[PDB]
Paper text:
Adeno-associated viruses ([name]) are single-stranded DNA packaging viruses of the Parvoviridae and belong to the genus Dependoparvovirus. The virions of the AAVs are composed of non-enveloped capsids with T = 1 icosahedral symmetry and diameters of ≈260 Å. They are assembled from 60 viral proteins (VPs): VP1 (≈82 kDa), VP2 (≈73 kDa), and VP3 (≈61 kDa) in an approximate 1:1:10 ratio. In this study, the structures of the [name], AAV11, AAV12, and AAV13 capsids were determined by cryo-EM in an effort to complete the panel of available structures for the defined [name] serotypes.
[name] belongs to clade D and is closest related to the clade E members AAV8 and AAV10 based on VP1 or VP3 amino acid sequence ranging from 85 to 88% aa sequence identity. Compared to AAV8, the [name] VP showed different surface loop conformations in VR-I (1 aa deletion), VR-IV (1 aa insertion), and VR-VII (1 aa deletion), respectively. In fact, these [name] loops are unique among all the available [name] serotype capsid structures. [name]’s VR-VII is the shortest loop among all [name] serotypes with a 1 aa deletion compared to AAV1-AAV4, and AAV6-AAV13 and a 4 aa deletion compared to AAV5. Greater structural variability between [name] and AAV2 was seen in VR-I, VR-IV, and VR-VII due to single aa insertions (VR-I and VR-IV) or a single aa deletion (VR-VII). The only exception was the apex of surface loop VR-IV in [name], where aa 455–458 (GGTAG) were disordered, preventing the reliable placement of main- and side-chain residues. The glycines on both sides of the apex likely confer the flexibility of this loop and thus the cause of the lack of structural order. While the VP structures of empty and full capsids were largely identical, some alternative side-chain orientations, e.g., histidine 230 ([name] numbering), were observed. In the [name] serotype structures determined in this study, the histidine side chain preferred the “left” orientation in full capsids. In contrast, both orientations are equally adopted in empty capsids, except for AAV12, where the right orientation appears to be favored.
Numbering used by the authors:
A (entry chain L), B (entry chain B), C (entry chain C): 218 to 737
Write the structure that this text describes.
C-alpha cells in the first residue's frame, strides 16, 4: 500500500458486467480475523477422541487464516445466476483478481468484566498467497468459511490446518510439517493494501444444457435397419412344444430396444435407494451399514457424492441415492437436522446419458449354455469405463463449489471434481493471513523461555474478488419454448432470495445450471 | 444452377482413382423422392401400438427426405475394396464433395384407374445440408435407404424423422420440436443444381491389419527371465503329506503363462454363446431373456454389437456371441429370416489383443486366506478399463457403416462407433430434401382453413458423392506370403458380386479389411 | 425477375439472427391466389341483409388480393419469442424487406366432373405495393389471412375490399371509388420475381417490462412527510357529542393513502365486469345492452378492446372486462364458440399505473357543503386526460397485431393502436396481387359487349418477409430472480407449440411480452 492512517486504501466495488461473450463478476466483503491458537502451531490427532479406525487422523493446526471464495453465490447474485443459466450453454472462468484493503487492527483488553477495544495503529498483519502450490491445499473440500452469499454480511476468516499421513493416531515417517512463517509474506499496516492477479488454465466449458435425446433413442423412428439381431432361439410356439430354431429380425420402429447402437451409458458405481416418505424405507439403520463406500488402506471411506448418475428413475421423484447427491441446508439449520430442513439436489438431466444411481448398470451372461445347461446371467452393479461410453459431469449449483485441485499423480481418468465444477492442476492459490504477534511487556531480566504473553488483538477489513467468466451461446433451432428458471409469481409472505423481517438472508432452494436443451 | 429446361445440369461421373497414398472414389446414382405425410409434420409415439416399457418412444415424422451414403459399398466396388484391403495397413477419409443435378419434378394424376404422369416444369424441390449440426442426427444408426451398392440401381430417398425425450408414450418438458422449413434451403427447378464440399476432421487410420503376435506371447522364447514368481505354496509331494513352503521360480520357455508381462487384454462386457448347429443350443428362448443388455432410465436396451471382442475361441468356429456380431442379409431375405439367409461377420483377428466375447475376462481372488481358510476366487464377467490395457476396434465391412457422430457430452472414453468406422465430432452433414407443395385450385371465396388439397407430385434426379481417402502403406519385412482376399477360382453357376439371370445384384459374403498382418 | 421457366427465381430462407442489440427475423411461406369476383369490381352494402342501423355499410369488393404479415407469430417462433421477452425491456421494428418469387400460374378446366390442372406458362400476375398510401388501408384491422404461424403451412391470399362513407345502405356524395388497375403494377411470369425494401419511421420502444412499484407507493416508507393534510373535521369523539374542529396530520408510514403524491393513474373509460364462473353472472343478456360503446354519427360502436386498463383487481382472477380484453381462439374453434374454446389475455402488469377496467376511476365532490348541508360526492366512471397522469400501453402478444396506421387527422392524443403494437403514420405499404385475365376464345364477329368469358386459373408461389428489430437491454440491479416464460416441465400427451398426431399446429396459450420488471 501507499498512504497513511486517514486515507482509505481501496474503494468498495461489487457489481456484475455482462459484455458480449463474457461476464465479469466483482464482489466485495467485510471480514474479521481472530488470533488462532494463541499464535501456536499445534498437532492434532484422533487420539484425543477415540472415534474409530476409519476416522483416525493426524495433522497440524496453524495460527494462520485463509480466504475462501470457492462457491458460486460468492460471485453471483440470484438474478445474475439466472441470466447465466437461462441464456447460455456453458461457462468457464478466465481471470481472477484479488484485493485486501482498508485494514484495521484492534487491540482488546478485558478488565473487571468490561471489554475495551481500541485501534492499534502500528500493528501489522501478514498475507501471502501460495503461488507455487507448496502447502497442503485444503480448498475444494467444501468447507464453511467462504464469503457469504449476501454482500451486507460480515464473515470470520476460517483457521488453516492440514492433515498428513498417519498410522492410527500416530505419525509415520513421511508425515510432513509445514511452518507457514517459512514463506515470504507481505506485512500490512492500516495504510497498506494487498493485491494479486491470477489466470485460469484452459478448461472445458461446463455443460449448462440438458440433453433433449437419449442414447438409446438416437435412431430414426421411421426407417428400418439393415442389421439383423437374434430374436428367438425357439420356434414360435403353437401351444404344443418348443422346437429349436434360430430366427433373426431387423431392428425397426416396432422394437427399438433390440436395435443396434454405437454407444453405451456412462460408468456407474451403484448406491442404495432411500425414500423421502419414511414409511417406505426399511426399519433399520442402513445409512452407514448399507452404504456404498470405498476401502483405502484399511479405512472405509463413504463414497460421496460419487460418480455422476441420475438420482431417480423417470416417474419416481421421492427416491434419492443414499450418498449420491449434494445436500444443502435451509437457513437456520443446525449441524444435525431432519429431512425437512435440508435442501436436496437431484440430477434428472443426465438420465439420457447416465445410469440411475440407485439401479443396475446392466446384466451380463455368467455361463456357457449348452443343450442340458440353461442360460444364466449376473447383474452389473459396478462398471468401469468401456470403449464407447459417454456421460455427463455432475451439475454445478449456486451454492456449490466452483473448482477443485486435481491431485499431482502419475495418472488420472477424466479428472473432474465429483462434487462439481472445474478440475484444475493449478487452481487459484490459497491466500493465507495472520495477525502478527505483539508481545506484552518482557520481564526486564533476561530469560530464554518462550513468551506466551501477548496483546490480544484482531483485525478487520474489506476483501474484493473479481472473476472473468467466458460464455457459450445457445445456437438451438428448437421451435418450441425452453424451460426457464422462473420466480414464484403467486403471492407469498416473503420474497425468495431476500432478507426477512429479522434481517436474515436466505436461499430457499438450490439452483442448477441445466435448463436449456440440446441434441445428443 | 444456371441454364434452363433442355440443358443437363451435370454429367454422370462414377469412377475410382488410385494415386500414390490416396484414392478418390466417386459414385453417381439415380433417386426418386415421394411426398411424405401429405406435406405434414406429425408426431409419432408408441401409444398407437402398446409394445412394452422398453420400446416406448415419442417423436416426429417430417415430409423431408434425406441422403444416406454411410456404407462403404456405396463408394467402393468389390474390386476397389480388394485393392484397399490387400495392399494397405489403414485408411481414413479426407474430403467429401456432394452434388445434386438433372432434377425432374413429375406431376401424377389418377383418373378412373388410369395413372398419368407428366413433367411439371415450374415446380421446385428444397435442399439444405445442416452444416451446424442443429437437427437431430439420425445418420450412423445403420438404417436402410443408403445409395445401393450397384451403380445401375435406382433408390428411393428415405423419410426423415426423429425421436426426443419421453415419459412412457407422452412427452416431457424437454422434448424438442424442430420445423425444418425454419432453416434456409435452396429451391431448385429442372435447370438448377446443388453442391457442397466437406472436409473430414482428423481421425486415426482404421486398422486393416491383423496382429501376428499375441499379448501373452510377446516374450523371447529362448531366454529366461530374471523375475521370480511364486510357484508353489506346498512342498513337492512325495505321496505322504504336503508341507507348507514358499517356492519361487523364474519364468522361462517352459512356463510362459506364469511369466511376467507388461500388458493386459482389452476390456470385456460378456455375452451369451450361441451355436450354429441347432442341436447344441439349449431348448428355451434365451435370446431376449438370457441376453446381455444395459439398463438406462428404467429401459433395458440390448447391447448390440457391443464392445469389440473376439467372436469365438481358437478351434471353435460354430459358436458366435448372441448380440456380439454384425449380421447382414443375403439377397432376397425378408425382415424375419433363419440362420441360412443371414451373413454373419466374425472378428477372429482381434483374438491376440481382445477377450473372447463369450467367455470370462479372468478370475480374481475373493477372500483373504489363512491357515483354516481356503483360497477363493470369483470369475470376472465384465471388466472396465485398467492401466495397461490394449485392444482393437471392431472391423469395418464393405456393407457396414463408415462413420457415426460422437455425441456432444462432458466426457467419453475412447470414442469409436461400436458398430464400426470413424467416430466424428463433426460428421458429414445431413442433406435434407423435400418436394415443395403445389396447391390445388383454391375455393375462390376466402376461407382461413389449411388447404390439405395439393397436386400429387414426385421428383427424380441424379446424385454424385466423391470422397478422398488416405492410405497407410504396408512396411512389413515378413518373409512368407500374406493372406489375401481371393476370388472363388473353381467354376460356379454365377459370378460373385455380379448380377444373376434376372438382373438382381447380390453380395455373397461380408468382407472385412483385416488380412495383412503386423507385429504386436 | 431475370431467367426463364426452368430456373428458380428465389431461395427459401426462413431463419432468425440474434446479433448484439438487433434481431433479424426472416420468414418464408407458400401461398395460393384464386380469382376473385370473376375479375369484377362490385359494390357491397348492407342492403342485401338488413342488419341494423349500427351495422350498415357501403363499399366495394375487388378482384385484387393482398399480403398480410401483421402478426408477430409470422416473424417469430415460440422460442425466438421467448428469447425476446425474457431478455429485453423493449423492441421496435427498424427495416423491412419483401419478396415474391417462384411464381406458378395454373389453368384449371372442369369437364364431366373431372377437374384438370395444367401449367399456363405465358400467363402473368400483377403485383404492386402502395407506397404513397393512396388506397384505403385495411391492414391493422386484425383480420384473418395473415401468413400462418407455422412455416410448413400453405395459406390463401385474402380478397381486398374497402368501405367508404354511407347514409344507411346508400352512398353519399363523398363516397370514393378506387380502381386498382389505375395504378402502375409489375406483371410477372414464372421467371419474374418481385421485391421491395421498406424502412420503419422512428417509434418508441414497446414496453416489455412490468413495473415493480405502484404510483401510490412510490414514497419512502420509513420517513414522514413535511406536508399536512386535513385528517378530521370533527373532534375525536368520546362517545358524547361530536364537536367541530379542523385537525391536520402529516402523511407518514402509518397512513400512506392520505399522503401527498405527484402523479395520477391513467385515464379510464369504464366497462362491465363478467365472471368466468357462469353462476356468478346475472341472468340476462347484458353483452350488447350493458356494453360500453361509443356513439358516432347515430351509430353505436362497441368499444373494443378500448383504453388500456388492468383487467381485474388484485385477488380476483375470474373476472374480466366485457369488451376490455383481446380474445384468441384455440385451434379448431369455430366462429361461434363458448368460453372453453377461447384464449383470453389479461393485463395484470399495468395495475400499478392503470385503473382496473371494471371499476371506478375515483370519486369527486358533487356539492358545496355548509352547516345544514352534508358533503356529497359522485363516482367517476369515465376520465379524460389530466395533467400528471401516467399510463401504460396495452401489451403485444405473439398472436396479436404488430402495427396499425395512425389516421391522417388534424389532431390525435397519444396515438397508439388500442389493440396493441406500433402506431405508424407511414406503416408498411399494402401489397396487392391479382391474376391477370386471360380471355376465352372471342366470338369471331365483332361485338362491343364485355367478355365475361375467361379461362379459370390461379397462381401459387413463395413469399418471404424480413424485418430487422432493435432491442432494449435489461439494466436492472434487482437482486432476486425475475419471472420468466417457461415450458411445462411435467409430462403431457403432446408438446406445446408443436404439431399433433394429425399434423395440426396449435398455440396453446397467448404470450405477452411483460415479464422482466423495472422501477416506476
Amino acid at each position: 500500500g501507499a498512504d497513511g492512517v486517514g486515507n482509505a486504501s481501496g474503494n468498495w466495488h461489487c457489481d456484475s458486467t455482462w459484455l458480449g461473450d463474457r461476464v465479469i463478476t466483482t464482489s466485495t466483503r467485510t471480514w474479521a480475523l481472530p488470533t488462532y491458537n494463541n499464535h501456536l502451531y499445534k498437532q492434532i490427532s484422533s487420539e484425543t477422541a477415540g472415534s474409530t479406525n476409519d476416522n483416525t487422523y493426524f495433522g497440524y493446526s496453524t495460527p494462520w487464516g485463509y480466504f475462501d471464495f470457492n462457491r458460486f453465490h460468492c460471485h453471483f447474485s440470484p438474478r445474475d445466476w439466472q441470466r447465466l443459466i437461462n441464456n447460455n450453454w456453458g461457462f468457464r472462468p478466465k481471470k481472477l483478481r484479488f484485493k485486501l484493503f482498508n485494514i484495521q487492527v484492534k487491540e482488546v483488553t478485558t478488565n473487571d468484566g468490561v471489554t475495551t477495544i481500541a485501534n492499534n495503529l502500528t500493528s501489522t498483519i501478514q498475507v501471502f498467497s501460495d503461488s507455487e502450490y507448496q502447502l497442503p491445499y485444503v480448498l475444494g473440500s467444501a468447507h464453511q468459511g467462504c464469503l457469504p452469499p449476501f454482500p451486507a454480511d460480515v464473515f470470520m476468516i476460517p483457521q488453516y490446518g492440514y492433515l498428513t499421513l498417519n498410522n492410527g493416531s500416530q505419525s509415520v515417517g513421511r508425515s510432513s510439517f509445514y511452518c507457514l512463517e517459512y514463506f515470504p509474506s507481505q506485512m500490512l499496516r492500516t495504510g497498506n493494501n494487498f493485491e494479486f492477479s491470477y489466470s485460469f488454465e484452459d478448461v472445458p466449458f461446463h455443460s449448462s444444457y440438458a440433453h433433449s435425446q437419449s442414447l438409446d433413442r438416437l435412431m430414426n423412428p421411421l426407417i428400418d435397419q439393415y442389421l439383423y439381431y437374434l430374436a428367438r432361439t425357439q420356434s414360435n410356439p403353437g401351444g404344443t412344444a418348443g422346437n429349436r430354431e434360430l430366427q433373426f429380425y431387423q431392428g425397426g420402429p416396432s422394437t427399438m430396444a433390440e436395435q443396434a447402437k454405437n454407444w453405451l451409458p456412462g460408468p456407474c458405481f451403484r448406491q442404495q435407494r432411500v425414500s423421502k416418505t419414511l414409511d417406505q424405507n426399511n426399519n433399520s439403520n442402513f445409512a452407514w451399514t448399507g452404504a456404498t463406500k470405498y476401502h483405502l488402506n484399511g479405512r472405509n471411506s463413504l463414497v460421496n457424492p460419487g460418480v455422476a448418475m441420475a438420482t431417480h428413475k423417470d416417474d419416481e421423484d421421492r427416491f434419492f441415492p443414499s450418498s449420491g447427491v449434494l445436500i444443502f441446508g435451509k437457513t437456520g439449520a443446525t449441524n444435525k437436522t431432519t429431512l425437512e430442513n435440508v435442501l436436496m439436489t437431484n440430477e434428472e438431466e443426465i438420465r439420457p446419458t447416465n445410469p440411475v444411481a440407485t439401479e443396475e448398470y446392466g446384466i451380463v451372461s455368467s455361463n456357457l449354455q449348452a443343450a442340458n445347461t440353461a442360460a444364466q446371467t449376473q447383474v452389473v452393479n459396478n462398471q468401469g469405463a468401456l470403449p464407447g461410453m459417454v456421460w455427463q459431469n455432475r451439475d454445478v449449483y449456486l451454492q456449490g463449489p466452483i473448482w477443485a485441485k486435481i491431485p499431482h499423480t502419475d495418472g488420472n481418468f477424466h479428472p473432474s471434481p465429483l462434487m462439481g465444477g472445474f478440475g484444475l492442476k493449478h487452481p487459484p492459490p490459497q491466500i493465507l493471513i495472520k495477525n502478527t504477534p505483539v508481545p506484552a511487556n518482557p520481564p526486564e531480566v533476561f530469560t530464554p523461555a518462550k513468551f506466551a504473553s501477548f496483546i490480544t488483538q484482531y483485525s478487520t477489513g474489506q476483501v474484493s474478488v473479481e472473476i472473468e467468466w467466458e460464455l457459450q451461446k445457445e445456437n438451438s433451432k428448437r421451435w418450441n419454448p425452453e424451460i426457464q428458471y422462473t420466480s414464484n409469481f403467486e403471492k407469498q409472505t416473503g420474497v425468495d432470495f431476500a432478507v426477512d423481517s429479522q434481517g436474515v438472508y436466505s436461499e430457499p432452494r438450490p439452483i442448477g445450471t441445466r435448463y436449456l436443451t440440446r441434441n445428443l
